[PDB]
Coordinates of C-alpha atoms in Angstrom, one line a residue:
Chain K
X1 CA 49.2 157.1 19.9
X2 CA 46.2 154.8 18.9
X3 CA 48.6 153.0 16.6
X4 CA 50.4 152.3 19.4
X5 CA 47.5 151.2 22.2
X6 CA 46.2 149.1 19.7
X7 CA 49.8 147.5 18.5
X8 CA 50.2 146.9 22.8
X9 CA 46.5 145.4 22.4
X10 CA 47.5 143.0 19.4
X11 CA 51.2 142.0 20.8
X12 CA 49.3 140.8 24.0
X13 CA 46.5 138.8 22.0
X14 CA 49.6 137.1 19.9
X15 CA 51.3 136.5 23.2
X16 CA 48.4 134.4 25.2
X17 CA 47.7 132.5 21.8
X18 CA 51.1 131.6 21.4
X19 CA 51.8 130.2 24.7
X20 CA 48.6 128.5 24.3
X21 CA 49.3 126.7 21.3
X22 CA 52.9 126.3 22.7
X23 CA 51.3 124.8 25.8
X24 CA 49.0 122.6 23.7
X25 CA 51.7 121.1 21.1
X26 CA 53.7 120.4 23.9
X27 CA 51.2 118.5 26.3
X28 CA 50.4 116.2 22.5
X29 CA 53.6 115.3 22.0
X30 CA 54.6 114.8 25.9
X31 CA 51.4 112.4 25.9
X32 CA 52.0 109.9 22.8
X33 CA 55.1 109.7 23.9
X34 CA 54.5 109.0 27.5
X35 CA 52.3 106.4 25.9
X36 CA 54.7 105.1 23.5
X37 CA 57.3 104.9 26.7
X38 CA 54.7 103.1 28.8
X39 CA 54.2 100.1 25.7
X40 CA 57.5 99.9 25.4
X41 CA 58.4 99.2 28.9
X42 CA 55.3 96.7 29.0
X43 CA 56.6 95.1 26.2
X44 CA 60.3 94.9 28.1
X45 CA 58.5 93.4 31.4
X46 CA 56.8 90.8 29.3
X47 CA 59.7 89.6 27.5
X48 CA 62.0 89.4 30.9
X49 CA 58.6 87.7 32.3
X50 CA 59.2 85.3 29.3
X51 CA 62.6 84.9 29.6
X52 CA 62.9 83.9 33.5
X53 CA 60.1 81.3 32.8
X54 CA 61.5 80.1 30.3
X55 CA 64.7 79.0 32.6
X56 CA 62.2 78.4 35.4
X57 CA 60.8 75.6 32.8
X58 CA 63.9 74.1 31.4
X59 CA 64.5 73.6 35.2
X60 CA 61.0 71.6 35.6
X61 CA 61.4 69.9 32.0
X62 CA 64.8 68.6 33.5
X63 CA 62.6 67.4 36.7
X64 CA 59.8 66.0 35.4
X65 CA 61.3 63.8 32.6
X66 CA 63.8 62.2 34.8
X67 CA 61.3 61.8 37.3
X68 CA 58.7 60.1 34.2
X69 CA 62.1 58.1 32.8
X70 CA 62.6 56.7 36.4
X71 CA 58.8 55.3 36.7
X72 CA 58.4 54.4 33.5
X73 CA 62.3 52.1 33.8
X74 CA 60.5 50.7 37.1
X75 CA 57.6 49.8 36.0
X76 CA 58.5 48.0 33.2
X77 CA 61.1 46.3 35.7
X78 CA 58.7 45.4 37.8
X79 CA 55.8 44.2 34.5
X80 CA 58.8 41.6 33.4
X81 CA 59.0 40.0 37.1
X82 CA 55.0 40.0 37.3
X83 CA 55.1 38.5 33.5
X84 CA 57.4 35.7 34.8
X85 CA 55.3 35.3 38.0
X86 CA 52.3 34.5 35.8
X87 CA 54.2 32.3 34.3
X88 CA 54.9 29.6 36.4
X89 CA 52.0 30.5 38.5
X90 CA 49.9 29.4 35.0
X91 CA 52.4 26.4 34.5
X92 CA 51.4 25.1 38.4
X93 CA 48.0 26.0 38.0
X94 CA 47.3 23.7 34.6
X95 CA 49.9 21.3 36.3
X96 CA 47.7 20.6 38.8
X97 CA 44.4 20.4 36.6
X98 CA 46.3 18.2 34.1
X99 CA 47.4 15.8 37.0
X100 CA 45.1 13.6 38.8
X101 CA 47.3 13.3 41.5
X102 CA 49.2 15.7 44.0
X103 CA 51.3 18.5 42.5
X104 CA 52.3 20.8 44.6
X105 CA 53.1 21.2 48.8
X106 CA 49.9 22.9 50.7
X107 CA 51.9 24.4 53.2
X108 CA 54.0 26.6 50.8
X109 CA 50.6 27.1 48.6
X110 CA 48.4 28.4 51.4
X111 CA 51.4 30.8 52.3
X112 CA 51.9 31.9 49.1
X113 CA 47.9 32.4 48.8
X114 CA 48.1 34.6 52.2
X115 CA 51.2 36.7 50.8
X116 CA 49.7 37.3 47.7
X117 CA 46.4 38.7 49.6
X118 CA 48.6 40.5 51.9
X119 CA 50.0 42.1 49.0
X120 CA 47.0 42.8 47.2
X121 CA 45.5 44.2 49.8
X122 CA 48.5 46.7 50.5
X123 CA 47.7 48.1 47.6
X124 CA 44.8 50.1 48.3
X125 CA 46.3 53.9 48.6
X126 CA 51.6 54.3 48.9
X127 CA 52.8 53.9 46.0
X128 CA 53.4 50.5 43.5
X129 CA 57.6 50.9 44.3
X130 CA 57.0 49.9 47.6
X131 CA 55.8 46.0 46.7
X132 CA 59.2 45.6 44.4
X133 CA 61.1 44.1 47.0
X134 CA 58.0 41.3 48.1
X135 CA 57.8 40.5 44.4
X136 CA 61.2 38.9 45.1
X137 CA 59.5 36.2 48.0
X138 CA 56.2 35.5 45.7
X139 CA 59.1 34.1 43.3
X140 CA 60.6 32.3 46.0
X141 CA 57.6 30.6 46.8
X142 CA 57.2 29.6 43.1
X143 CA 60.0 27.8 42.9
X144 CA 59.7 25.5 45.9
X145 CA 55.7 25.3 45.4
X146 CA 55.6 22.1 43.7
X147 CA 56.7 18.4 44.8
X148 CA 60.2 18.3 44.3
Chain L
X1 CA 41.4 12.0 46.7
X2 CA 40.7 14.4 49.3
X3 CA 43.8 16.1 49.1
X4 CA 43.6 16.7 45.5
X5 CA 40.3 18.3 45.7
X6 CA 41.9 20.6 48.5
X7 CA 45.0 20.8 46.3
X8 CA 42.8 22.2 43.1
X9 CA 40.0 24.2 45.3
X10 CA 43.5 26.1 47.3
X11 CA 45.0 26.7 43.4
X12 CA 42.0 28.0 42.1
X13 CA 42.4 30.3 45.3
X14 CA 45.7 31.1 44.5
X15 CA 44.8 32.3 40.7
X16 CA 42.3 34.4 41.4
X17 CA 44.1 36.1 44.5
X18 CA 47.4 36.4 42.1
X19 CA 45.7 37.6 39.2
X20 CA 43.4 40.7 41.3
X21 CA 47.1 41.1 42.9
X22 CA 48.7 41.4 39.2
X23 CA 46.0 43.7 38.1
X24 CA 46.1 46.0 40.8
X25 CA 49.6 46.4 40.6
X26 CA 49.6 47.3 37.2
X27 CA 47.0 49.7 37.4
X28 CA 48.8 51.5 40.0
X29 CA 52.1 51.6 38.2
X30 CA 50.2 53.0 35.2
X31 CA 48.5 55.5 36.9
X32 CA 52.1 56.9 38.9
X33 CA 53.4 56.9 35.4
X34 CA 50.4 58.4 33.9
X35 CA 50.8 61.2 36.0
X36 CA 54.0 62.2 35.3
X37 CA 53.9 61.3 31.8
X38 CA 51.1 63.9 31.5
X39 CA 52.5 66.5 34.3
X40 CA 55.6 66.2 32.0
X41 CA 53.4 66.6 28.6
X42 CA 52.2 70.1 30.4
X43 CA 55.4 71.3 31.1
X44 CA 57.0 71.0 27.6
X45 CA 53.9 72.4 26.4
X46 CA 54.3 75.8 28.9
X47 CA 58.1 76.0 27.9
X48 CA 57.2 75.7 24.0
X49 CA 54.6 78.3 25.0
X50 CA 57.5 80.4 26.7
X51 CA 59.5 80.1 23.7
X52 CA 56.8 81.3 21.1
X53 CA 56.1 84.2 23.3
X54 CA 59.4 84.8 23.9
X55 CA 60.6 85.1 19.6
X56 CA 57.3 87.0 19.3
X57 CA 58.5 89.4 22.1
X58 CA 61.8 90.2 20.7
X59 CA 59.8 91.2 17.6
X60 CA 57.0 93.6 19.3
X61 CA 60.3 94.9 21.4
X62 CA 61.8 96.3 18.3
X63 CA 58.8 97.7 17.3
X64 CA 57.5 99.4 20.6
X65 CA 61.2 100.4 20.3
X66 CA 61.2 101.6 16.9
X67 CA 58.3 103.8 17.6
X68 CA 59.5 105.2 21.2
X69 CA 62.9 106.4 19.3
X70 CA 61.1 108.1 16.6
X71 CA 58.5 109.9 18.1
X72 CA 61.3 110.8 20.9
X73 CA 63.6 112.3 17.6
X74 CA 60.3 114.1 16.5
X75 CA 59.1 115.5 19.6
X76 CA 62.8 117.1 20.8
X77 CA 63.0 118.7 17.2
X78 CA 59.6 120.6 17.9
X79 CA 60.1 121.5 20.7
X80 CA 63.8 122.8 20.0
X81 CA 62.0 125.1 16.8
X82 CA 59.2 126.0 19.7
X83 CA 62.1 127.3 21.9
X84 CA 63.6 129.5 19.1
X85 CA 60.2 130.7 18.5
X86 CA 59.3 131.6 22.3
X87 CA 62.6 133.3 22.2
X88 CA 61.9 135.2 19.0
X89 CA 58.3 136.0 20.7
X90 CA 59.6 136.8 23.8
X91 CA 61.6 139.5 22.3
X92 CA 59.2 141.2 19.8
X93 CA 56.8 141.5 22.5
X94 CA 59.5 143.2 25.0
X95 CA 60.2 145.2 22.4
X96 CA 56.8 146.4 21.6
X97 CA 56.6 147.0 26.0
X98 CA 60.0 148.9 25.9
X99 CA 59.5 151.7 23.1
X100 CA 56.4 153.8 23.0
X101 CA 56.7 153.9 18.7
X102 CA 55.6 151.2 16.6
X103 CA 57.6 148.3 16.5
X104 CA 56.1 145.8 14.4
X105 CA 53.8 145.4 11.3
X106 CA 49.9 145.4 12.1
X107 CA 49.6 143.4 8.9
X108 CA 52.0 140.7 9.5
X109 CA 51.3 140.7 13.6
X110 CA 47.5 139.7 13.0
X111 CA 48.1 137.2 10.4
X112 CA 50.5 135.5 12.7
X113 CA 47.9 136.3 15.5
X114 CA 45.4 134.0 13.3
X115 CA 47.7 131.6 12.2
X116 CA 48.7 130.7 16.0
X117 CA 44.9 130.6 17.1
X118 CA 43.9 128.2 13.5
X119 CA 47.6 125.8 14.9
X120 CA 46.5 125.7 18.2
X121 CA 42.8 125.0 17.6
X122 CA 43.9 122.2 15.3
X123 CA 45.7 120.5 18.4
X124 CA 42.2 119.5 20.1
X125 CA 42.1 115.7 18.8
X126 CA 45.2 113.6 14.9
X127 CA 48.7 113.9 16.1
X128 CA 51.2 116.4 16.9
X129 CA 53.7 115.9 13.9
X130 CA 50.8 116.7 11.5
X131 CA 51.5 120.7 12.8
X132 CA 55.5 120.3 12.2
X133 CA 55.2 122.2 9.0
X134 CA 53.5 125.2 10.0
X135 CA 55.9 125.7 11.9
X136 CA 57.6 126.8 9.1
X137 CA 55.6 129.9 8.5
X138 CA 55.4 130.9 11.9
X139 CA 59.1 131.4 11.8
X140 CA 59.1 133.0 8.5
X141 CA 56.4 135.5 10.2
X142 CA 58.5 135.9 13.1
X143 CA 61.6 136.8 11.1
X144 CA 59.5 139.5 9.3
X145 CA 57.1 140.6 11.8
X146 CA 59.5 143.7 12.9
X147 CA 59.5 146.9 11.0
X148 CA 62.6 146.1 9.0
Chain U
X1 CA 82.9 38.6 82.2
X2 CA 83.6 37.5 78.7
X3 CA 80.2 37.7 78.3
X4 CA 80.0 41.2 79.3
X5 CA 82.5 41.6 77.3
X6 CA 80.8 40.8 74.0
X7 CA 77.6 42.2 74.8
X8 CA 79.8 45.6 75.1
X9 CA 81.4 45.1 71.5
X10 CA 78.1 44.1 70.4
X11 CA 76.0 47.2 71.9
X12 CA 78.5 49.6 70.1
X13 CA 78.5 47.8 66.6
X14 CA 75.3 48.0 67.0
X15 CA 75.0 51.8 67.8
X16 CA 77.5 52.8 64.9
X17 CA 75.6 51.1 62.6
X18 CA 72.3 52.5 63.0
X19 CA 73.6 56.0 63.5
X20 CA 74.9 55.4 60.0
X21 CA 71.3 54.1 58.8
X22 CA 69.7 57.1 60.6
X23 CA 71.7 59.6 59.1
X24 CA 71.9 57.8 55.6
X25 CA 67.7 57.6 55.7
X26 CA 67.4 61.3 56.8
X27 CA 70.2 62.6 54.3
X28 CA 67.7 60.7 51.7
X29 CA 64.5 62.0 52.4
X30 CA 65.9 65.3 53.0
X31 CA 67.4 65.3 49.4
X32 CA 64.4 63.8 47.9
X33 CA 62.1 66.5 49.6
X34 CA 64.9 68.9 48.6
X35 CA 64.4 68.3 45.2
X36 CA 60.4 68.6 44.9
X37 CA 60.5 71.5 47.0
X38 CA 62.9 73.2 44.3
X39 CA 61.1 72.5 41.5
X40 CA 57.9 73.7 43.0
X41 CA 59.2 76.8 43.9
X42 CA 60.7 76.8 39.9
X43 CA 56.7 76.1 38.8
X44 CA 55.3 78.6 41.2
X45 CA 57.7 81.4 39.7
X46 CA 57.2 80.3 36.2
X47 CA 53.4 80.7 36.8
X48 CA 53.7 84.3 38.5
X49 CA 55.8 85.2 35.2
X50 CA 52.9 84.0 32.9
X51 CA 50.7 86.0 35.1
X52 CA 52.9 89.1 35.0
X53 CA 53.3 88.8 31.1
X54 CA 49.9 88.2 30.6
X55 CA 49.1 91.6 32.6
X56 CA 51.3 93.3 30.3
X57 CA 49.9 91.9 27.6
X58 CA 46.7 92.9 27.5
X59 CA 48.7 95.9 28.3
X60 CA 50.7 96.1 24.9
X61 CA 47.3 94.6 23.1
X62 CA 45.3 97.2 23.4
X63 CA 48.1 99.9 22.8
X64 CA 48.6 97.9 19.5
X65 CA 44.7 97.4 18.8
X66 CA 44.1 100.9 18.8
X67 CA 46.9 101.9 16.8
X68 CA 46.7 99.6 14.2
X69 CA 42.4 101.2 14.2
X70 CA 43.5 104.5 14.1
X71 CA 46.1 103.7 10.7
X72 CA 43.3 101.9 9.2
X73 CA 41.1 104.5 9.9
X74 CA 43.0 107.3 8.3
X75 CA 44.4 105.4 5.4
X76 CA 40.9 104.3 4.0
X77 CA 40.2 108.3 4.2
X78 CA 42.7 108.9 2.7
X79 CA 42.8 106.4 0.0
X80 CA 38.8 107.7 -0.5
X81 CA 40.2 111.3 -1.3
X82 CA 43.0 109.8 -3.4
X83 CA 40.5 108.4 -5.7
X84 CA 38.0 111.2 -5.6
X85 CA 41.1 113.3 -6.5
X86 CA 42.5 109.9 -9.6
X87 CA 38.8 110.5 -10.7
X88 CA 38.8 114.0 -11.6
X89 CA 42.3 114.0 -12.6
X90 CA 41.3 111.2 -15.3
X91 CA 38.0 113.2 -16.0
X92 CA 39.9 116.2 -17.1
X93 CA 42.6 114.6 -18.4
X94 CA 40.3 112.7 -20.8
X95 CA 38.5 116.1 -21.4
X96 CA 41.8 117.1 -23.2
X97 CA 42.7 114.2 -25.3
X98 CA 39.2 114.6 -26.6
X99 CA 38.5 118.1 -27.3
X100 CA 40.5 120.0 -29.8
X101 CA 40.4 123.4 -28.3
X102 CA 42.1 124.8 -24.6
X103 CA 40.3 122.8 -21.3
X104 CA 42.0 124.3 -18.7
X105 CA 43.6 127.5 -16.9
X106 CA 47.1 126.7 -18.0
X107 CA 48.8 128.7 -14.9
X108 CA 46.2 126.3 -12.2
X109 CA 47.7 123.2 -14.2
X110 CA 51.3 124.0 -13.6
X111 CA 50.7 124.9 -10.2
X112 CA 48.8 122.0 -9.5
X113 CA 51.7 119.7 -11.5
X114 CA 54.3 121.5 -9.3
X115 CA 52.3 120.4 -6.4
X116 CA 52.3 117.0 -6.9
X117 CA 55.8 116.5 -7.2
X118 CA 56.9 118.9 -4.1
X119 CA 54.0 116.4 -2.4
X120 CA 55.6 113.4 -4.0
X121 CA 59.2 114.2 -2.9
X122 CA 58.2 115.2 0.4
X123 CA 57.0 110.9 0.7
X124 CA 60.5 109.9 0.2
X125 CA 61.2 109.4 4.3
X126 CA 58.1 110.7 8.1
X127 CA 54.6 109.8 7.7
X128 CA 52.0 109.5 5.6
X129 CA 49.4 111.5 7.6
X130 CA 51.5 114.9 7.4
X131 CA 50.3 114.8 3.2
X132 CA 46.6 114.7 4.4
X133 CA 46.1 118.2 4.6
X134 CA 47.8 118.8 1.3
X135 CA 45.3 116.1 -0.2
X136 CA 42.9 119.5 0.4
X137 CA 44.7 122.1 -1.3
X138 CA 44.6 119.6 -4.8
X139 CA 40.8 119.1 -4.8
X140 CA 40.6 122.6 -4.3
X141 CA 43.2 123.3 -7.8
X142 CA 41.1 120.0 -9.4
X143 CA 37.8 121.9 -8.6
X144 CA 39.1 125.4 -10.3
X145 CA 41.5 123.5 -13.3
X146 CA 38.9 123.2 -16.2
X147 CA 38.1 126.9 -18.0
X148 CA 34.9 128.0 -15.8
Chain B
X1 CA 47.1 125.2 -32.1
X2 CA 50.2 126.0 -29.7
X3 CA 48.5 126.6 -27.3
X4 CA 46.7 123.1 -27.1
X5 CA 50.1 121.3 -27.6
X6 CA 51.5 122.9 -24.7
X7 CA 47.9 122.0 -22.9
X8 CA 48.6 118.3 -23.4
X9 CA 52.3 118.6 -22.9
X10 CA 51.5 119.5 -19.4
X11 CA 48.2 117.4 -18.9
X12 CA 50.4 114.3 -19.4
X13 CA 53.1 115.6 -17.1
X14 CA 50.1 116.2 -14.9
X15 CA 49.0 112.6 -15.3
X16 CA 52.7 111.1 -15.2
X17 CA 53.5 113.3 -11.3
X18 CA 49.6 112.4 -10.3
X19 CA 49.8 109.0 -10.3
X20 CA 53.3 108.8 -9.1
X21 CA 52.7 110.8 -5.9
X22 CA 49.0 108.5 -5.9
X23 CA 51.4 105.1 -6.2
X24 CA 54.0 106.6 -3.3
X25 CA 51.2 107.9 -0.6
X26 CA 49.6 104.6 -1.0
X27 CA 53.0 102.3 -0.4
X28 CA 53.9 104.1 2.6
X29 CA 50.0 104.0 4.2
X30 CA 50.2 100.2 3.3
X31 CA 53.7 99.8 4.3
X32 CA 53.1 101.5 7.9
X33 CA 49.7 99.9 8.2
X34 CA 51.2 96.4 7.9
X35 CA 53.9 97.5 10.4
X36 CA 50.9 97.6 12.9
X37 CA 49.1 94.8 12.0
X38 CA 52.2 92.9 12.4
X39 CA 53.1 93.7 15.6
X40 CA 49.4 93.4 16.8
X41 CA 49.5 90.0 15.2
X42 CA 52.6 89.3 17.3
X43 CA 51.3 90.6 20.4
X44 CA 48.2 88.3 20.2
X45 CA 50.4 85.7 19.4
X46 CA 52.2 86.5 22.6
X47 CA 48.8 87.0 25.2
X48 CA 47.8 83.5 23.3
X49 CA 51.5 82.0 24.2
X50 CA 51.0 83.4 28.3
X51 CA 47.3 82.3 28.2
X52 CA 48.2 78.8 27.0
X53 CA 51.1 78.6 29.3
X54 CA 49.4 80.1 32.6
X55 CA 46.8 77.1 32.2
X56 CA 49.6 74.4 31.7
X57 CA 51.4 75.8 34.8
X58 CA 48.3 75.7 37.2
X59 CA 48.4 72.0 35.8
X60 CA 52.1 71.7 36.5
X61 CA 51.3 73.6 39.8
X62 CA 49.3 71.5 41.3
X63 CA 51.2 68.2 40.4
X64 CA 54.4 69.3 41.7
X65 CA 52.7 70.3 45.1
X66 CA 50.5 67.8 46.0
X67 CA 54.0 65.6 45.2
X68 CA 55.9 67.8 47.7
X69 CA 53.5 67.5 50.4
X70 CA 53.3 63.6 50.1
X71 CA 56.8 63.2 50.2
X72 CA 57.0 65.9 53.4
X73 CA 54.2 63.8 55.1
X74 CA 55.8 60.8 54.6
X75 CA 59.2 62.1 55.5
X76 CA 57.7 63.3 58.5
X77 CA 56.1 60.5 59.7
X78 CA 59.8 58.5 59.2
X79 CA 61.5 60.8 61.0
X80 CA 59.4 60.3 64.3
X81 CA 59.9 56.6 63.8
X82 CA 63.9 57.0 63.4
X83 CA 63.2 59.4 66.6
X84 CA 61.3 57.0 68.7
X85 CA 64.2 54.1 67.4
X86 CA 66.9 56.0 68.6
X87 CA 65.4 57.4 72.0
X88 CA 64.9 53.3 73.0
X89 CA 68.3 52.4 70.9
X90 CA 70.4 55.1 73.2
X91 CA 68.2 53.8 76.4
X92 CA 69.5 50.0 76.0
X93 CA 73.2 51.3 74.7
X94 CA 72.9 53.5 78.2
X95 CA 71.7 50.4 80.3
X96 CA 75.0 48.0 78.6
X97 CA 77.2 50.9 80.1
X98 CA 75.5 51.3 83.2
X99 CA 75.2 47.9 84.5
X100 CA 78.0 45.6 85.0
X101 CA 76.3 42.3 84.4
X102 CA 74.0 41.2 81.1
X103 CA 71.2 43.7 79.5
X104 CA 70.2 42.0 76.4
X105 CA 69.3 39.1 74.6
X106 CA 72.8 38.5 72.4
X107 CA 71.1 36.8 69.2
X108 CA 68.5 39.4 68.9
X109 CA 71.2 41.8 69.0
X110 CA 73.4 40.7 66.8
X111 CA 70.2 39.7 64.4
X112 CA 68.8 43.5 65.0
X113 CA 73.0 44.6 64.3
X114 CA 73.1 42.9 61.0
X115 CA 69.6 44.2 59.8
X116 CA 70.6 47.6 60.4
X117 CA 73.9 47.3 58.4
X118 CA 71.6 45.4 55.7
X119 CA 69.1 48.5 55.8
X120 CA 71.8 50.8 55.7
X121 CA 73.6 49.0 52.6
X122 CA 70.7 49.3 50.9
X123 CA 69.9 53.2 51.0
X124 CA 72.9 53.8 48.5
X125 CA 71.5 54.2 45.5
X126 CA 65.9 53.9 44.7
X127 CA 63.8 55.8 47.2
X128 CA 63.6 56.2 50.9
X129 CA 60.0 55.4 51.1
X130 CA 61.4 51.2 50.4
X131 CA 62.8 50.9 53.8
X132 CA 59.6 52.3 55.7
X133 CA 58.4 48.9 55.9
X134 CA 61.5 47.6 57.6
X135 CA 61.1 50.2 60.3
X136 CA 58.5 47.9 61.9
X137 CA 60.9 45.1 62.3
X138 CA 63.6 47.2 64.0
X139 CA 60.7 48.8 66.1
X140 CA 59.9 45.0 67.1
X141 CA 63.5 44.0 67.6
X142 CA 64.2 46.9 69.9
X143 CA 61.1 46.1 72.2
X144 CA 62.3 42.5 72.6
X145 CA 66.3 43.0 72.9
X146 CA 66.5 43.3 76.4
X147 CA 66.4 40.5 78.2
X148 CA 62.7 40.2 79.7

């Protein structure tokens, strides 16, 4: 009778404290795993994020040193025909302060004097690939400069 | 006479003009190649960059990966001995609703009463794998919770 | 007539030609542009990765900051019981190698011995947090070993 | 007498098991421990890598695209040349077939002919940017071709 209500009374106590703690363990573990999860599929982003820059850069490492490699064989090909421009333009120069008489023709000096100016003066902002081929003419000029 | 003091005044012209041409040229051609020398120097520095990351991603994947699978393991075991416990529950209590005479011990029903409301009062904040053991006992309490 | 003639021939050399030219100067800058364009667009995704990873990894940081607090946290508790608990042992310990007459409750000493090695089998393989609450249980036996 | 035996008997089996279990639970705290510090080492490591990288990409960035947009100005501005070149090449080629009698001034053509196929012959193999220059002289030998 009373051993019974109060058997009813304690199997519905047990039952609501169960499913409580049932409840409870399962929302814990749910949650560190859920966070788990979510590192691991940050961790998986940033190593794909790794991986297609690191094809993205051997693409611009390809790029940029051919490109670096093509300026630097240019501009050393272009320092060897200013090196033998100075030169002869030093050889004519001390020619003509050595000699007390004429050295060289004026006509082809003052032309060379305007080209180099020209040239000069070109080169404020274009790039230094574009004066190359004039390079060629300046040399020209040095040949036929003096008497002869 | 004359003419050689034209001759040496249009030289001097001509060094100075060649020599600002010469130096303006190379400063241009080093600073081109400057450029890409050091847009070059940045770009192996990001791929090296990429690379690190990229070995120390692999690692922190295994981990993160490690850890996912095991707590994964852990937290399906729990909650496969929660479901046999709900069921065994789930059963007493109908038991106890279904016949009007006692059903199970008053002794053993509190203690297990107690023991759910200490397990589940344990769970607010530590992790959930610290409660795997008990249970343990909760079964055992289960098992001889019925008159029997 | 002939003349005519000529200036026909002439005209359409002429216009072959620089069709030719035209189209071998556009196909050239066309390529050229081609090939900066393309490795921009390489550099602007390799930057976008970098940001993405570095998203995600201040992401997987924390997650790993936090852990690696929380292990430290609860192993220096737990070493401080541990040596609490070696303390006591020792104290005893050295109580019976001293005195020649009983120390302590012989049945709390095999207990307590039994204890230790269920807790030090239990370590071989899961965590080392699940043998905290055990850690209690000892101190308590420790507490209640010697005779009083 | 016995009784004390059997005490140290079991205080040193006590001992032996104590320190065993002490040695084990302090391995595995360590080992796991260092599990996390490695990874968060590795992670940092990682951030570090993106950090370092994201900074030599803005670099890398901005290089390649202030290069793309010079050479697309540039291109730019050669293409309307080429444009305006053709629109006044097709005109004379237009007025040879239309009228029956003399158009054009048969030096210049032939002079303008062969500087095309020169220009032309050249753009096989260095940049496109070399034969802007030459796009004046065509321009100028295009204005005086016909004859007036």
């Amino acid at each position: 009778i009373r051993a019974k209500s109060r058997e009813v009374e304690l199997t519905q106590q047990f039952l609501n404290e169960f499913n409580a703690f049932k409840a409870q363990l399962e929302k814990h573990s749910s949650e560190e795993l859920a966070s788990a999860l979510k590192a691991n599929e940050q961790a998986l982003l940033a190593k794909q994020s790794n991986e297609v820059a690191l094809l993205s850069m051997k693409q611009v490492e390809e790029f940029t040193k051919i490109l670096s490699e093509k300026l630097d064989q240019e501009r050393q090909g272009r320092l060897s025909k200013l090196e033998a421009l100075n030169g002869s333009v030093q050889e004519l120069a001390e020619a003509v302060d050595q000699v007390d008489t004429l050295v060289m023709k004026s006509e082809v000096l003052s032309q060379l004097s305007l080209l180099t100016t020209l040239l000069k003066n070109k080169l404020h902002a274009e790039s230094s690939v574009k004066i190359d081929s004039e390079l060629a003419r300046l040399k020209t000029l040095c040949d036929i400069l003096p008497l002869e």
